[PDB]
Write a protein that holds these residues in place. Structure first.
Motif, PDB file in Angstrom:
ATOM      1  N   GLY B  98       0.794  -1.217   0.000  1.00 39.51           N
ATOM      2  CA  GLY B  98       0.000   0.000   0.000  1.00 39.51           C
ATOM      3  C   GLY B  98       0.825   1.265   0.000  1.00 39.51           C
ATOM      4  O   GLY B  98       0.397   2.303  -0.539  1.00 39.51           O
ATOM      5  N   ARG B 100       3.978   1.544  -1.407  1.00 39.77           N
ATOM      6  CA  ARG B 100       4.427   1.679  -2.785  1.00 39.77           C
ATOM      7  C   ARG B 100       3.290   2.220  -3.643  1.00 39.77           C
ATOM      8  O   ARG B 100       3.512   3.053  -4.535  1.00 39.77           O
ATOM      9  CB  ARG B 100       4.941   0.354  -3.351  1.00 39.77           C
ATOM     10  N   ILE B 101       2.057   1.808  -3.343  1.00 44.06           N
ATOM     11  CA  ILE B 101       0.927   2.267  -4.129  1.00 44.06           C
ATOM     12  C   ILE B 101       0.808   3.775  -4.033  1.00 44.06           C
ATOM     13  O   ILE B 101       0.923   4.488  -5.033  1.00 44.06           O
ATOM     14  CB  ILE B 101      -0.373   1.637  -3.622  1.00 44.06           C
ATOM     15  N   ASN B 104       3.857   5.886  -5.366  1.00 40.73           N
ATOM     16  CA  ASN B 104       3.842   5.897  -6.820  1.00 40.73           C
ATOM     17  C   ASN B 104       2.692   6.754  -7.353  1.00 40.73           C
ATOM     18  O   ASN B 104       2.854   7.478  -8.333  1.00 40.73           O
ATOM     19  CB  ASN B 104       3.756   4.467  -7.327  1.00 40.73           C
ATOM     20  N   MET B 105       1.545   6.688  -6.695  1.00 39.56           N
ATOM     21  CA  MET B 105       0.401   7.480  -7.111  1.00 39.56           C
ATOM     22  C   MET B 105       0.640   8.983  -7.006  1.00 39.56           C
ATOM     23  O   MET B 105       0.237   9.730  -7.889  1.00 39.56           O
ATOM     24  CB  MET B 105      -0.852   7.080  -6.343  1.00 39.56           C
ATOM     25  N   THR B 108       3.789  12.121  -9.708  1.00 39.14           N
ATOM     26  CA  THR B 108       3.816  12.745 -11.020  1.00 39.14           C
ATOM     27  C   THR B 108       5.046  13.653 -11.123  1.00 39.14           C
ATOM     28  O   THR B 108       5.868  13.517 -12.051  1.00 39.14           O
ATOM     29  CB  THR B 108       2.501  13.490 -11.196  1.00 39.14           C
ATOM     30  N   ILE B 125      -4.490  11.984   3.785  1.00 36.18           N
ATOM     31  CA  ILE B 125      -5.293  10.884   3.259  1.00 36.18           C
ATOM     32  C   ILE B 125      -5.276   9.707   4.222  1.00 36.18           C
ATOM     33  O   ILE B 125      -6.325   9.192   4.620  1.00 36.18           O
ATOM     34  CB  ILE B 125      -4.795  10.465   1.862  1.00 36.18           C
ATOM     35  N   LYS B 129      -8.720   8.142   6.300  1.00 37.81           N
ATOM     36  CA  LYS B 129      -9.085   6.738   6.162  1.00 37.81           C
ATOM     37  C   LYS B 129      -9.090   6.045   7.516  1.00 37.81           C
ATOM     38  O   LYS B 129      -9.912   5.148   7.746  1.00 37.81           O
ATOM     39  CB  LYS B 129      -8.124   6.029   5.196  1.00 37.81           C
ATOM     40  N   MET B 259      -5.526 -22.239  -1.841  1.00 37.19           N
ATOM     41  CA  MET B 259      -5.398 -22.850  -3.169  1.00 37.19           C
ATOM     42  C   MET B 259      -4.447 -24.052  -3.179  1.00 37.19           C
ATOM     43  O   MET B 259      -4.423 -24.796  -4.169  1.00 37.19           O
ATOM     44  CB  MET B 259      -4.954 -21.814  -4.208  1.00 37.19           C
ATOM     45  N   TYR B 260      -3.632 -24.224  -2.129  1.00 34.65           N
ATOM     46  CA  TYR B 260      -2.858 -25.453  -1.966  1.00 34.65           C
ATOM     47  C   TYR B 260      -3.773 -26.628  -1.627  1.00 34.65           C
ATOM     48  O   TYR B 260      -3.983 -27.523  -2.458  1.00 34.65           O
ATOM     49  CB  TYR B 260      -1.785 -25.264  -0.882  1.00 34.65           C
ATOM     50  N   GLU B 268       5.936 -28.578   3.822  1.00 32.10           N
ATOM     51  CA  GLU B 268       4.814 -27.748   3.391  1.00 32.10           C
ATOM     52  C   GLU B 268       5.016 -26.307   3.820  1.00 32.10           C
ATOM     53  O   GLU B 268       5.119 -25.399   2.992  1.00 32.10           O
ATOM     54  CB  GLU B 268       3.485 -28.230   3.992  1.00 32.10           C
ATOM     55  N   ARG B 271       7.904 -24.339   2.263  1.00 36.12           N
ATOM     56  CA  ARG B 271       7.541 -23.933   0.911  1.00 36.12           C
ATOM     57  C   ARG B 271       6.478 -22.844   0.931  1.00 36.12           C
ATOM     58  O   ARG B 271       6.653 -21.789   0.321  1.00 36.12           O
ATOM     59  CB  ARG B 271       7.060 -25.141   0.101  1.00 36.12           C
ATOM     60  N   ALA B 272       5.388 -23.065   1.665  1.00 39.07           N
ATOM     61  CA  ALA B 272       4.281 -22.118   1.683  1.00 39.07           C
ATOM     62  C   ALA B 272       4.767 -20.713   1.987  1.00 39.07           C
ATOM     63  O   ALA B 272       4.471 -19.769   1.245  1.00 39.07           O
ATOM     64  CB  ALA B 272       3.232 -22.565   2.697  1.00 39.07           C
ATOM     65  N   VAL B 275       6.841 -19.427  -1.135  1.00 45.17           N
ATOM     66  CA  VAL B 275       5.942 -19.054  -2.225  1.00 45.17           C
ATOM     67  C   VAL B 275       5.267 -17.723  -1.924  1.00 45.17           C
ATOM     68  O   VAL B 275       5.380 -16.758  -2.690  1.00 45.17           O
ATOM     69  CB  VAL B 275       4.887 -20.162  -2.438  1.00 45.17           C
TER      70      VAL B 275
END
Lengths: 309, 315
Positions: B98, B100-101, B104-105, B108, B125, B129, B259-260, B268, B271-272, B275
């Protein structure tokens, strides 16, 4: 006479065209129909084939490395697609690229970044899953499996190969829609674009926007296929686009073109054409208010991608 | 007094300065507010003139002098807005994405640098919020309860934009400030348990994870670590911080587990995490989590329970 089946399954049988030892199957052609058309040309009619007729059918399947944005159109009729595989392909078309990369990495203990035929079988079945009334009264091979693992199923599927399979399928369906409107030319009109987006929307809103494009100043050029496909990739990542428009808070304000362009880039990585953005605004602004309202736009587009296929 | 919500109840509880009617944390008070349950001296504000506060600010370190020990070295010679308390809290709790969002937003003009005025607005802002998340939360509370019955300069601003506020703040700089603050707070917790040594014990770790969770269940886990076989090495700070980075990506970890396929083993879990976050825990780290949480149920970890302990821990 089967009242026992769910909506999606009903559909599958409705478009399916092959029965082989009792099981039903789409051709590649039937699948493109299923994701492009509302009803089939011939409904609930299965040609029956011998186990061998099917094998023979399959043996002329291209290997994964001859895959392309024209795989299914080239195969057409001579191929087999399981109902589970149908749901798998629907997922590849509708859902974001992320879940696939995650679940594949999760199953790649053995690989590495390669998957076994058996691992893929299980992984695909995973994607499928995703008393008071008593009181009142008183495995078979398919084009995909041969493509991914060869004829006797012993090859392993590289992740990048499979990922470009995903890309190819997405580009094939997009090309078919785009052709639908372009009858072979390089571009489509503002009106074409609008009709594609609004095609699955409440006819009130569709009324206002389509009359907005028909009444408005004429376009100078059209949308290339590349601007088209970029826009539908963005539709796959609409969720994060919304996410991003939230932290560019706070009052559900309205967005300008340079704004909207930046928002797309940041939230999805894609850099739209100035022209593509302008075309969006001509479709949707309706001079409300020379800048676009993001939460209305998010609503219709939410609808469009999911119920489009 | 009683007119106030939870969050600022605290801001005033730990605040230490009043200047022309407004209240302020030091760097020190902020570290306390985020590491201990109560202040040393409560709701007592020493009053300052704008000129005292100004001078206090004039010795603020420039951006290139930041570190995982910035706030500690600032001590009490610094000023923190209530808005900025909330901003810093966001830095501690929310996922990096958020930030980085919105940077970047707003870039300009930059690029990738932001102006002081841009930062002020972006910060406003983040405040609004937070305001109406809490306000709508409270109105929601009292609504069901009814159903049942019936501009001024700052440590941060000088740090980021210089002394007359005219520098621009690069992205690499601000993201490294975020990182430094997070490891400061973590390093303090780790000291708390290590009294200066290189590692903390299994039981230390367990207590840290569970400390902000319901005491029934925490009880079962703590007696599991107390009864089990002894740890061979204990956990370094690097594994400690890695683990809390991972806790910032808990949402993506959950999605990775969904989804695993709630029966998860060590390989497990390793890895989890990888990933869903990019991070590769030490084998020792994985083993220790399993020693703390399994309760031999059953050399497998329970996916939805663990996510539960950790929602709790982070919030």
């Amino acid at each position: 006479l089967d009242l026992y089946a769910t909506s999606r399954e009903r559909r599958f049988r409705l478009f399916a065209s092959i029965e082989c030892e009792g099981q039903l199957f789409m051709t590649p052609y039937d699948f493109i129909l299923a994701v492009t058309t509302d009803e089939p040309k011939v409904a609930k009619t299965w040609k029956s084939l011998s186990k061998q007729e099917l094998n023979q059918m399959l043996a002329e399947t291209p290997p994964v490395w001859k895959g392309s944005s024209k795989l299914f159109r080239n195969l057409k009729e001579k191929g087999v697609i399981s109902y589970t595989e149908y749901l798998f392909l629907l997922c590849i078309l509708t859902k974001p690229h992320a879940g696939f990369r995650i679940a594949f990495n999760m199953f790649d203990t053995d690989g590495n970044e390669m998957v076994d035929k058996k691992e893929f079988l299980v992984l695909q079945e995973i994607f499928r899953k995703k008393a008071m009334l008593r009181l009142q009264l008183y495995v078979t091979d398919t084009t995909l499996l041969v493509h991914f693992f060869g004829k006797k199923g012993k090859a392993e599927l590289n992740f990048e190969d499979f990922y470009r399979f995903m890309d190819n399928l997405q580009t094939e369906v997009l090309e078919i829609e785009f052709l639908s409107y372009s009858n072979g030319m390089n571009t489509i009109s503002e009106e074409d674009f609008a009709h594609i987006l609004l095609r699955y929307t409440n006819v009130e809103n569709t009324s206002v926007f389509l009359e907005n494009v028909r009444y408005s100043i004429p376009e100078e050029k059209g949308i290339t296929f590349d601007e088209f496909r970029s826009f539908f990739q963005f539709l796959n990542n609409l969720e994060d686009f919304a996410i991003a428009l939230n932290m560019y808070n706070f009052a559900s304000r309205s967005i300008g073109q340079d704004e909207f362009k930046r928002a797309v880039y940041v939230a999805t990585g894609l850099k739209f054409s100035p022209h593509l953005v302008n075309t969006v605004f001509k479709i949707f602004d309706v001079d409300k208010d020379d800048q676009l309202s993001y939460k209305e736009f998010i609503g219709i587009m939410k609808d469009r991608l999911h119920r489009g296929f």
